[PDB]
Coordinates of C-alpha atoms in Angstrom, one line a residue:
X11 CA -7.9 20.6 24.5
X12 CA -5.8 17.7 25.2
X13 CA -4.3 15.6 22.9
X14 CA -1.0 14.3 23.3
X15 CA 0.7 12.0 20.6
X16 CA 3.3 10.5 20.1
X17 CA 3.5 9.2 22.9
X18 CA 3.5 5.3 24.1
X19 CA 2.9 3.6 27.4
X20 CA 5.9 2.5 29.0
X21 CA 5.0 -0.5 31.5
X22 CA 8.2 -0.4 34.0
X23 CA 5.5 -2.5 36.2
X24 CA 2.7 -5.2 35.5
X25 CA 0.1 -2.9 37.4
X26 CA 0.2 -0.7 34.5
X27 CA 0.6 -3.5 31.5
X28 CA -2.5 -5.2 33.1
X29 CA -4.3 -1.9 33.4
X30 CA -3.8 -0.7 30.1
X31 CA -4.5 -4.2 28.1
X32 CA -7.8 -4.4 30.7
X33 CA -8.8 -1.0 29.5
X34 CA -7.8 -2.0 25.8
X35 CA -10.2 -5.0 25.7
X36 CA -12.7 -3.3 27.4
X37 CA -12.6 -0.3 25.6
X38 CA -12.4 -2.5 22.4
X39 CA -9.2 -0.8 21.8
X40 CA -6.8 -1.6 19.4
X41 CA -3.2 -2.3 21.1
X42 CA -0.1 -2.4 19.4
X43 CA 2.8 -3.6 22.4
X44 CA 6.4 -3.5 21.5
X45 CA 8.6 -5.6 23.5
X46 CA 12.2 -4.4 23.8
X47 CA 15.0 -3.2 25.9
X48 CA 16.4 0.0 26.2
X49 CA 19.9 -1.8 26.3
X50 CA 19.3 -3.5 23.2
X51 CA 20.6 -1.4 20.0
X52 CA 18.5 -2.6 17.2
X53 CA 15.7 -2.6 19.6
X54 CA 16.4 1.3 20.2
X55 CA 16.5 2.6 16.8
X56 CA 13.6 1.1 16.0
X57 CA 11.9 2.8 18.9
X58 CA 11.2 6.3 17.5
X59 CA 10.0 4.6 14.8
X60 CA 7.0 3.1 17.1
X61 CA 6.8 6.4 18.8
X62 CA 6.0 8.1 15.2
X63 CA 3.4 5.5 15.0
X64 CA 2.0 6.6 18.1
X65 CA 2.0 10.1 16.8
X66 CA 0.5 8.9 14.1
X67 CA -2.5 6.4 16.1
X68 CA -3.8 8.5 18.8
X69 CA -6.6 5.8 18.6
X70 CA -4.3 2.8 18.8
X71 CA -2.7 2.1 21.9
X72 CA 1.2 1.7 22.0
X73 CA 2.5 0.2 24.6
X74 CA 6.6 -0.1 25.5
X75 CA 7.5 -3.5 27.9
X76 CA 11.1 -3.4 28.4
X77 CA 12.1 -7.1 28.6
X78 CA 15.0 -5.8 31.0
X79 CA 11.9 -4.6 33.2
X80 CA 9.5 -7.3 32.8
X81 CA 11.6 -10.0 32.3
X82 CA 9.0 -12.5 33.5
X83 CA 6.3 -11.1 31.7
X84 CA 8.4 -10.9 28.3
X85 CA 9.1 -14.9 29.3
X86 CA 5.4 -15.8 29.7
X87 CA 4.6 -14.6 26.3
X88 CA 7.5 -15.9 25.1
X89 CA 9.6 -12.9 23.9
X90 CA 13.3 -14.7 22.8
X91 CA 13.8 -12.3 20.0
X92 CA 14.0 -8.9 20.3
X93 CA 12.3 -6.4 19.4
X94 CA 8.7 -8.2 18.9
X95 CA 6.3 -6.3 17.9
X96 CA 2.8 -7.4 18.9
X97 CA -0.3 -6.1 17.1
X98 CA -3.7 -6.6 18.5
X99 CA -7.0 -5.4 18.0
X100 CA -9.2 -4.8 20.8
X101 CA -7.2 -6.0 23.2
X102 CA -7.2 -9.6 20.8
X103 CA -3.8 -10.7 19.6
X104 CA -4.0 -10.6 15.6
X105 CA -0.2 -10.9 14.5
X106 CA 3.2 -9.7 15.7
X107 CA 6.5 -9.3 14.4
X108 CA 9.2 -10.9 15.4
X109 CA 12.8 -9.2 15.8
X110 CA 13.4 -6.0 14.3
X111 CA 12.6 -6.0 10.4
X112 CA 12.9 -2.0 8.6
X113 CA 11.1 -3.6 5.1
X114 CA 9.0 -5.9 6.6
X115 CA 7.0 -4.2 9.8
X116 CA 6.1 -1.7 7.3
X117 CA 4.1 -4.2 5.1
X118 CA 2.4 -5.8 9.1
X119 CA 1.6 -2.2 9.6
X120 CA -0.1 -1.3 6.0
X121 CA -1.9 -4.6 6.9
X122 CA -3.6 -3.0 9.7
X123 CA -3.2 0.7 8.0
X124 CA -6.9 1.1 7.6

């Protein structure tokens, strides 16, 4: 029996971004993708929060893309401010949240909390 939570998939390459957000629309898989950088403070404390998510959402698909890493990828989606949180459902972009916000992601994540 395998089942490992808590766990999120860090992209450090577009192979794996595009493989996962193929498999997510396919599989009609809901996505949630943080964009962030490990060098980035807010953007780090944050993170275990996202993880804990994860441990929570075995079904939803969390997703790290360090802007540090992906740098072109995070500038073709147009990630300025970071954190941005992007939530999707089945692979189609619903809403995201922009920059890191404690009181506010919690009320974009009861949104989808269902």
């Amino acid at each position: 029996m395998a089942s490992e939570e808590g766990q999120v998939i860090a992209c450090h390459t577009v192979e794996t971004w595009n493989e996962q957000l193929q498999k997510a629309n396919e599989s009609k898989t809901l996505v949630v993708v943080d964009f962030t950088a490990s060098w980035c403070g807010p953007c780090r404390f944050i993170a275990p929060f996202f993880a804990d998510l994860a441990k929570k959402l075995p079904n939803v698909l969390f997703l790290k893309v360090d802007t540090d890493e992906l740098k072109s990828v995070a500038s073709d989606w147009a990630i300025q401010a970071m954190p941005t949180f992007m939530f999707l459902k089945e692979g189609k972009i619903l809403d995201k949240v922009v920059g890191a916000k404690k009181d506010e992601l919690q009320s974009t994540i009861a949104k989808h909390l269902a």
